[PDB]
Amino acid sequence: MNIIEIKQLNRYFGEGENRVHVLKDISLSIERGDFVAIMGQSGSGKSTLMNIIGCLDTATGGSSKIDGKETIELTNDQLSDLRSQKFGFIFQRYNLLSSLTAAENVALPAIYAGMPQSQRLERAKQLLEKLGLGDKWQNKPNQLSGGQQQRVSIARALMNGGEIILADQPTGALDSHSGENVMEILRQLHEEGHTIIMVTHDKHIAASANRIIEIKDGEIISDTQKRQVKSAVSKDQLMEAFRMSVSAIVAHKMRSLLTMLGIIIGITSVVSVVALGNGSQQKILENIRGIGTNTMTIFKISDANTLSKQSYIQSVTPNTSSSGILVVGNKSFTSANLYGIGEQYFDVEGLKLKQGRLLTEDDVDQSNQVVVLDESAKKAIFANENPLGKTVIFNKRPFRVIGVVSDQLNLYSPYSTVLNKITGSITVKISDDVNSTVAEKSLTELLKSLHGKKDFFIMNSDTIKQTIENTTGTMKLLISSIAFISLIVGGIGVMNIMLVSVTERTKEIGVRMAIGARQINILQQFLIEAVLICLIGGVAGILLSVLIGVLFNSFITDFSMDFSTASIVTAVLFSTLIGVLFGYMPAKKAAELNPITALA
Amino acid sequence: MNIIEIKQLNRYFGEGENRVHVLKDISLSIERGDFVAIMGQSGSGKSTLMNIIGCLDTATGGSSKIDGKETIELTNDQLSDLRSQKFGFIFQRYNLLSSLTAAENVALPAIYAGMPQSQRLERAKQLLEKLGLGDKWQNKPNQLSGGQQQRVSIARALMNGGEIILADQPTGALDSHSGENVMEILRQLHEEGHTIIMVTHDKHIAASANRIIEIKDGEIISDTQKRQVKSAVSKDQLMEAFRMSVSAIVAHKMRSLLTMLGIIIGITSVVSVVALGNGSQQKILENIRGIGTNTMTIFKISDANTLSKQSYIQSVTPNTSSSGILVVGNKSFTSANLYGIGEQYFDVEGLKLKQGRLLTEDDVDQSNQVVVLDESAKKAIFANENPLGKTVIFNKRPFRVIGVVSDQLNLYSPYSTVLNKITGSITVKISDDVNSTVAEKSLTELLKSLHGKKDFFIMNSDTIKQTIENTTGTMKLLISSIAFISLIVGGIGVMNIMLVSVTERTKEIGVRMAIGARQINILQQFLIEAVLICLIGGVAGILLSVLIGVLFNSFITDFSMDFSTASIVTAVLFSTLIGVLFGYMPAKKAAELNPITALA
Ligand SMILES: Nc1ncnc2c1ncn2[C@@H]1O[C@H](COP(=O)(O)OP(=O)(O)OP(=O)(O)O)[C@@H](O)[C@H]1O
C-alpha cells in the first residue's frame, strides 16, 4: 500500500535557548513507486526529513515506517541492511571518500553488500559511463569538479540498486545537459519500478516528478499529484576488510609511519633500559665481589677434606702460622710472618696471581720449601727485580720463591712445610648463591655429624655478601621503577598518536555507515589496521633494540648491555595491547552514533 | 582601461599519462566595473580560471595582470593584499572554518585587514542580515543548511568590500527568492562601481550580467555584451594573533590536551630517571664507602699532630701494640692483643660505636687504663652480658671496659697507656674528595718538610677509593645513557603528536591565505599556539615530577629520589624547542603553497 509512512514526525536540535523546532508534526505517506519532488526555502527542514527517511538521523518524536516496519524498533544491523539495499542516498554535499578514486568510491557500498570485486569495478565504471565520467574513473574527488563529484555521488547511490532513491538536490552543481541526463536516469529507474524522493529548487527538474511537496518552516504546505499511482505487486567479509585496512594504511602514510614509530620506541626504550640496567648491575656487583670474599673460619685434614665436598662450599684451607726471622743479602728482617696455608687459599681469600705460580698439590704433599710472596713483602725485599726462583732463609731454613699475590712481612708456604720444617684453623669460602645465615647453621650441623662436639666458636666474615644483597635490592628498585616509567611513557605515546589518527576519520565512518556497512564491518578493518600496524612496528622494535645493543656493546668498554627476553615479551605484549585498544575504541564509538552526527 | 588582462593563459594538471590540458590559450580582457557571467559545461575549466584571477592558483604559462600588474611577478605579501582588498571570493564548495560561528567566519578576512573587532562583529552581523541569516549569526557551519553556509560564504566575500567579486556558482544551493536577493546585492555593488565575475548555470542569474562568456573544453566559445561599458575614473597584529591561537586551542581540546600531556611526560620522564639514578648512586656509593675506609699507614706525636692539620687528611692515629695475656673469671686467655691506638682511630678505620663510649682525649692524656672491646672479643669474654664497667687484667694490670666497636682477641687502649703501663706507626684517613695518588705524593712532600729523610716506606690501602671511582664511572654511564634515551623518546613523542595535529589543519591555512592573511600572520598564531601550549605543559611537567618525587620519597625506604636542577632546565628547554619547531615547520610549509593546493 504505502512504502513510507511518517506520522506525527517532530525534530528538534539544540538546548534552549539554543534549541530550534525544525520538523513540526509532519505526517507524510509516500506511495510505493512514486516519483516525488520536495521543494522549499533554504533551511526549512528538507534535508532533515530526507535523513530520517533513509535512516541516517532519527526523529525526536513520532513514527517513521519503511514497508510498514517501524525504523526505531529495528536492530542496528537491520538498519545497516536498509542503508545497503533499501535506500540509495545522494548527499547534498557529496560526501565522497577523498583517498579513493571515483570508481572505488562508487563500488564501496557494494563491498558491504558482498559482490565480487571484479563485478564491482566493471559496474561502477559503467555507472560513471552512464553519468558522463568514464573519462575520470581513476580521478580522486579532489581531482574533479564539483559537478563531477556530484555525479560520482549519484553513481554510488545507484550502485546497490536500492528500491528507494533519496536524492538531495542531485542536480545542484550541474549544467542543464548533465542535469537532464541525470533526470533521464532517475526517470528510467522510476519506469523500472523504483521509488524516487528528490529535494530540488529547479522547477524543470521538479516537473519530472508526478508528486510535488512543499515544505516551509518545518511544515508541509503543498501536496500535488498529476496522476493517480500504479498498484504494487563472516569469512570473505574479512578478506575484504583486510584489503580495506591495507590501502587505508598506505593512503595515510604519515599517520601510519608515526603511529608505528610510536610503538617502535615504546618497545626499544623499555628494552634498552632493562638491558642497560642489568648490564650496570653485573659490573657494580662484580666490582663489590672483587673487593674481598666471604668466608667462615673455624678457628684435622679429613675435616677440611669433606668440608670441601659440598656445593654450598666453594674452597677450603688448612691454616697454621709461624713468627720468625728472614734473611736475604746482608739484611735480616726480624719478626716476619710465614703463613702455612692450603691448596686453595688463594681462591678462598680471592688473592690474584701476579707472577709465577701458586702452591700446587705437589708442594703441600711433599712439604716443599717454597714460598709465595705478598705484593708488599715482594717489592720491599727484591726492590724492582724478578724474585722468581731466588731464595730466602726463614729460621736458617731455605725457601724457593715461586710466585707473588695480591693483598687484602707476609709469606705463604704450605701447612705441611710449616708443621714439618718450621714448627713441628680451617677456612671455607661460602658460595655466592647460597644464603649466609643458612650456611652458618648448615656447617654447625654438617661438622657435628663428624662427632666432635666443639670448639665450634665459628666466626665468619660476610660483609661483602651483605653489601651485594644490599645493593642488588637497590639496583632492582632502580631498574624496576625506571622500566615502569619508560613503559608508561611509551604507552601514552602510542595512545596519543593512535587516539588522534583514528578519530581523525570519524567522518569516514559516518559515510561507510550511511552506504550500508554494518557496525562490525567497521571494527574489522580498524582492528586489522591496528594489529597490522602494531605487529609491524613490533617486529621493527625488537630488532631495532638488538641493533642498538650491538652498537653499544661495540663502542662501550665499561659494561655490556645484556638483554632480557622477559622485557621483550612484556614491552611488545603491552605496546600492542594498548595500541589495538586505542585503535578500536574510537572507531567503535563513531560507528555507533547516527551517521549524520558522525558526518559532522 | 581594463582591470583584468589574461593573454595566452594555459593550465595543465597531472603527469602524462595522468596529465590534462585544462585551460587552452585563453585570452580574456575584462573591463573595469563590468558585470560578467561565465557559463559552461561541468568541468570545462571555469573554477580553474576563477582561481588564477583571484590569485589562488597560478597558471602554467601566459600572462595574467590585475590593474595591469603581472601577478606572478608580485611579492607574496603583495598578493596577500590583493586577496584581502582587491578580490572578494565566493567559493564553489563554501570553505567555511567549521569551529567558527557564522559571524566569526564572516569577520575573519577583516582581522588580516586590521579593523577593530567591535566594528567587525557589527558589520559581519549586518551582512548576515542583508543575506537572511541574522537569525543564525551564532551557528557554526555544521549547524546550518547548505544554502545557509553558502550565504555565509557570500557575506565573507563582501566583508572587506573588495573591488572585484569573484562569485563561483554563488546561487547553486539557494531557492529563487534567496537567490534573487543575492543577485539584488551583487547588482547594487555593480551599481556602486564594483566589478563582478560570476560563474553560473542558471540563466535567469546570468541575465543580471551584461557580459556572458561561455567556456567549453578549456576554450572560450561565446562573448556577448548587452551594452557598452562605463569609463573608469606588526603590534596589534600580534594581540589579535594571540586571541586567534587561544580560541584555536580551546576549539581543539583533544589535540591540545594530548599535545600538552605529550610534553608533560617528555619532561617528567627525563627528570624522574635523572633523579632516580642519582638517588641510587648515593646509596650504592655509600654502601661501598661503609665497607671500610682508605688510609695511609706510615709504618713522634708532633708529626701526627700537624699531619691532622690538613683538609686533605680527615683523621689521624698514633699506633703501638702489645702481645700478652688477659684474665677474667678463672679463664686466662693467652696471647691476647692490646692495640695502643689514638684519639680518632675509630674514625680512621670507620669502626662504629656499639655500646658505651670510645677513647676520649682525657684517656690518652692521662694514660688511662681503659679498654674498648672488639665485637668478637666482647661476646666471647662476656657471653651475653653487659661488659660496660667490668674489669679485665692484661699482664697483671687492671683495665676498665668502656665500650664496644665493630670489626673489619682484639683490645683497644690508648697509646699513652701501653707505652707507660704495659711496654714502656702513624695512620691517616685520606679524604673522600681528594685524589689518591695525589696525596701519596702530597704526604711525601709535606712530611719531608719536617726534615726527617725516612723511613718513608709508606703503605696505603685504597681499594674502596678505587671501587667507588670505578662504580661512579659505571653509574654515570648508566644515568647518562638512560637519560639520553628517555629524552630522545619524549622528543619524538612530542614531534609525532605535533606534526599530526598541525598538518591536520593545512586546509584551515589555505582558507586563511585565500581571504587575505599574509604568510607571517600564519606563523604568528602557530608559534603562539605552540609556545602557549608548550610552556603550560612545561609548567605542568616540572611540578608533576616534583609531586612524583614526594610520593616516591614518602613510600620508598631504600633510597631517595634526589632531583637535578640541570635536568629540569635541559628537559624543558628541549621539549619546547622541539615542540615549537614542529608546530611551526608544518604550518609554514602550508602557508607558502598555493591556497587551492592547500585547500586539498
Ligand atoms: N589536481 C588535478 N589533477 C588532474 N586533473 C584536475 C586536477 N584539478 C582539476 N582537474 C581537472 O580540471 C578540470 C577543472 O574543471 P573546473 O574545476 O573548472 O570545473 P567546473 O567547470 O567548475 O565544474 P562545475 O561547473 O561543476 O563547477 C576538471 O575537469 C578536473 O577533472
Ligand SMILES: Nc1ncnc2c1ncn2[C@@H]1O[C@H](COP(=O)(O)OP(=O)(O)OP(=O)(O)O)[C@@H](O)[C@H]1O
Ligand atoms: N545541530 C544543529 N543545531 C542547531 N540547528 C540545526 C542543527 N542541524 C540543523 N539545524 C537547523 O535545522 C535546519 C535544517 O534545515 P535543512 O538541513 O533541511 O536545510 P535545507 O532545506 O536542506 O537547505 P537547502 O535548501 O539550502 O539544502 C537548518 O535551518 C539548521 O539551521
Ligand SMILES: [Mg+2]
Ligand atoms: Mg539540503
Ligand SMILES: [Mg+2]
Ligand atoms: Mg565550479
